[PDB]
Design a protein around this ligand. Structure first.
Ligand code: GDP
Ligand code: MG
Length: 373
């Protein structure tokens, strides 16, 4: 019955990510607890005194790109592993960038392989490089907790000079205090993506869907957002399988009974929300992973002016893609940032995920990085 927090290890190949993952389970055991698109992930769990951690680790760079953009769980925090012996390397940079793009709110650093460094100046040098890297992508580099140690010593139950077990312990306690309790879906502002719309003989409207987050109750005031100008409405009932109720909750499939809505003020793909909670937008920055030929996507490389369908929750909307300055094409299996302009408005926030399709043939997965307009 402990608070659930999603974490993971990021950084360059060979810097110690998988080892630190194993050390974390061992150390938490000894000091606290117990123990289409193809994506290789390893999953692990450990408890501190106050939290249950669900921890993801991926083999290679390509896995991190796909998982962070379209992976099963969104990290509430990421542990950046950087080798103190080697200093930062290309995927040290790119994984911080990708964390920014994907909306990972916090990053903690473990400077690994301290057993290999007998040189205070080198540790200082590498720490400064990493703080700078973090600040380059708007993480608070100067205030980032950086723990120095040896994941491998910890994994082997060694703790000479507190480099091993103690350091991984300090890491977990940093997780405890630096990453806030995430807000559960049930406690966020109400949102349901609309699927079907049925007029109750002109006396009201049922809009159906699966509540994505929050709670809706009889008498609640609501807005209908996207595709056309926002309208207001009032909930007068909730239809569930077999039952008419006064309430519906995140996770539940229902029909929300509405009054004050005009037949065609409401359609599929709009979102029913707590008033003032989400706004409609058309233009945004996005990190996109373009599917592989093998993954059932495209074999063709596309160019500037590409106009695919963007799928957001329960509908799709045509959009124009602008590549970054210096790029003319994008091959299958690439991941790039691009600026997108939709033909119609749609409810959206930073961190919202979407699919890209051509004629019902999935070609990309993306996340909204930054809303423009
Ligand atoms: N000397 C030393 N080697 C380490 C440490 N942590 C990991 N390694 C070694 O680095 C190599 C790659 O580590 P691994 O955890 O698989 O790196 P990953 O690719 O980041 O997942 C392995 O041979 C590890 O034993 C450490 O603290 N000290
Ligand atoms: Mg690994």
């Amino acid at each position: 019955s402990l608070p659930h927090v999603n974490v993971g290890t990021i950084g360059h190949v060979d810097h110690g990510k998988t080892t630190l993952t194993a050390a974390l389970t061992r150390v938490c055991s000894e000091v606290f607890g117990s123990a289409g698109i193809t994506i290789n992930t390893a999953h692990v769990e450990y408890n501190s005194t106050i939290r249950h951690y669900a921890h993801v680790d991926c083999p290679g760079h390509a896995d991190y790109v796909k998982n962070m953009i379209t992976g099963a769980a969104q990290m509430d925090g990421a542990i950046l592993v950087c080798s103190a012996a080697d200093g930062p390397m290309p995927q040290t940079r790119e994984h911080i960038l990708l964390s920014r793009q994907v909306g990972v709110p916090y990053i903690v650093v473990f400077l690994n392989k301290a057993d290999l460094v007998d040189d205070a100046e080198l540790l200082e040098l590498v720490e400064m490089e990493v703080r700078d890297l973090l600040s380059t992508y708007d993480f608070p580099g100067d205030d980032t907790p950086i723990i120095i140690g040896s994941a491998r010593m910890a994994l082997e139950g060694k703790d000479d000079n507190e480099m091993g077990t103690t350091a991984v312990k300090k890491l977990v306690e940093t997780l405890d205090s630096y990453i806030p309790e995430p807000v559960r879906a049930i406690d966020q502002p109400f949102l349901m993506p609309i699927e079907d719309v049925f007029s109750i003989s002109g006396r009201g409207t049922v809009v159906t869907g699966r509540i994505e987050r929050g709670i809706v109750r009889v008498q609640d005031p609501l807005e209908i957002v996207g595709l056309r100008d926002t309208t207001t409405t009032t909930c007068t009932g909730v239809e569930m399988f077999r039952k008419l109720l006064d309430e519906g909750r995140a996770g539940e499939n229902c029909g929300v009974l509405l009054r004050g809505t005009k037949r065609d003020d409401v359609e599929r793909g709009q979102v029913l929300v707590k008033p003032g909670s989400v706004k409609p937008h058309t233009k945004f920055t996005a990190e996109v992973y373009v599917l592989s030929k093998e993954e059932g996507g495209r074999h063709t490389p596309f160019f500037k002016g590409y106009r695919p369908q963007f799928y957001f929750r329960t509908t799709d909307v045509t959009g124009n893609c602008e590549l970054p300055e210096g790029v003319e094409m994008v091959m299958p299996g690439d991941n790039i940032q691009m600026t997108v302009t939709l033909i119609k408005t749609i409810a959206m926030e930073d961190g919202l995920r979407f699919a890209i399709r051509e004629g019902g043939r999935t070609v990309g997965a993306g996340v909204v990085a930054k809303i423009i307009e």
